[PDB]
């Protein structure tokens, strides 16, 4: 999609360009601005040599999943729990990405509203 | 009425759509009869020489030798310098050479210039 229809058929400035997102400061919304937390360090995440595109904030669950698979080689089905933990963390990451998209969209809406309100006031 | 089939060089007219077969005349019939006569005479000669038990070799074919001789050795004595022939020969035998010369000369002059400014990035270029 519905977002594509509102960006291709509606107003391009109404919704983000996914290439350049975000276009606003991070701490613009609220002054807390908590940091993201990473569990896997440089060295162990290197030694497990996962993948460059698997080296994200979800790496520790992948480490555990990999270890579980390795120990139980004969019983492949046994490490069901490790997989769930990893996909749940990826689900949270994707939800956070969706939240960033919606956040920037709302900020763009409010900025357009502020500029049009200011233009109305100035012309009045 | 149905859409009409338009023949081309590589998609010819069907035999059943040919107006000439529907326009019959006694002269056409005698032409067909004598074409069949020529074909039958040739077939009879070939089969007489083919079924012969004494024959132990290739059956000589004048048509094949005529084809090969015309394709190879009859060309130059029948050649004349003609505007069509002269222009076609000049074009097809010179134009590609000068075209490729221009292309390669331009490419190599560009390469040489870029090497002169040093902006080619010839790193790891060891084997040439």
């Amino acid at each position: 999609g519905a977002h594509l229809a509102r960006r291709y058929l509606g107003d391009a400035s109404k919704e983000p360009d996914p290439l350049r997102m975000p276009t606003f400061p991070p701490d613009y919304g609220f002054p807390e601005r908590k940091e993201r937390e990473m569990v896997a360090t440089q060295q162990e995440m290197n030694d497990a040599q996962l993948m460059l595109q698997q080296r994200d904030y979800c790496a520790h669950y992948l480490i555990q999943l990999l270890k579980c698979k390795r120990d139980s080689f004969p019983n492949f089905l046994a490490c069901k729990h490790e997989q769930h933990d990893w996909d749940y963390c990826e689900h949270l990451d994707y939800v956070k990405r969706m939240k960033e998209f919606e956040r920037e969209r709302r900020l763009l809406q409010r900025k357009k509203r502020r500029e049009q309100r200011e233009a109305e006031m100035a012309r009045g | 009425s149905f859409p009409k089939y338009k023949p081309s060089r590589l998609a010819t007219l069907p035999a059943t759509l040919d107006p000439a077969e529907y326009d019959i005349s006694p002269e056409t019939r005698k032409a067909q009869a004598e074409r069949l006569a020529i074909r039958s005479r040739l077939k009879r000669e070939y089969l007489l020489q083919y079924n012969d038990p004494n024959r132990l070799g290739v059956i000589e074919d004048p048509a094949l030798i005529r084809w090969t001789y015309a394709r190879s050795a009859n060309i130059y004595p029948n050649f004349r310098p003609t505007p069509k022939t002269s222009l076609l020969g000049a074009l097809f035998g010179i134009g590609p050479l000068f075209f490729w010369y221009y292309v390669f000369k331009t490419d190599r002059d560009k390469k040489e210039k870029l090497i002169q400014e040093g902006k080619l990035d010839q790193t790891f270029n060891i084997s040439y």
């Binding site: 999609g1 977002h3 594509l4 291709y8 996914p18 997102m21 975000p22 991070p26 601005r33 908590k34 940091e35 993201r36 990473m38 440089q42 290197n46 460059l52 080296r55 994200d56 904030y57 990451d93 994707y94 956070k96 990405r97 969706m98 939240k99 960033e100 998209f101 919606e102 956040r103 920037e104 | 089939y5 338009k6 023949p7 081309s8 060089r9 590589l10 998609a11 010819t12 007219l13 069907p14 759509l17 074909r39 040739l42 077939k43 000669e45 070939y46 083919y50 059956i59 074919d61 004048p62 048509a63 094949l64 005529r66 084809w67 015309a70 394709r71």
Partner: protein, 104 residues
């Protein structure tokens, strides 16, 4: 040679030629192994228009789809350590500008 009668008893059944009959100047061009001129169910110009039209449309629509891509309502994927600076190219003696990832 392909459109010559295949039910006739030719002296050369594969080439579909007779012994003494004159040979076309371009026989080796038409040997059923190569270009044939047999009539087609559809006219040559119609096929050319259809083939060209289909290719052009697909080509045009691929360019249009490049202009208007498809994606999901998500922000960029985030990577922890300075966008994986040391794992992608390195140069650990430069200390690049820190990129901070926002919590939401």
């Amino acid at each position: 040679q392909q459109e010559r009668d295949p039910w006739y008893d030719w002296d050369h059944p594969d080439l579909r030629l007779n012994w003494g009959e004159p040979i076309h100047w371009d026989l080796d061009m038409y040997i059923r192994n190569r270009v044939d001129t047999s009539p087609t169910p559809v006219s040559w110009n119609t096929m050319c228009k259809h083939l060209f039209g289909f290719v052009a449309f697909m080509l045009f629509m691929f360019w249009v789809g490049e202009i208007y891509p498809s994606y999901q309502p998500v922000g960029p994927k985030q990577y922890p350590y300075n966008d994986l600076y040391l794992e992608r190219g390195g140069d650990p003696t430069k200390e690049p500008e820190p990129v901070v990832h926002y919590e939401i």
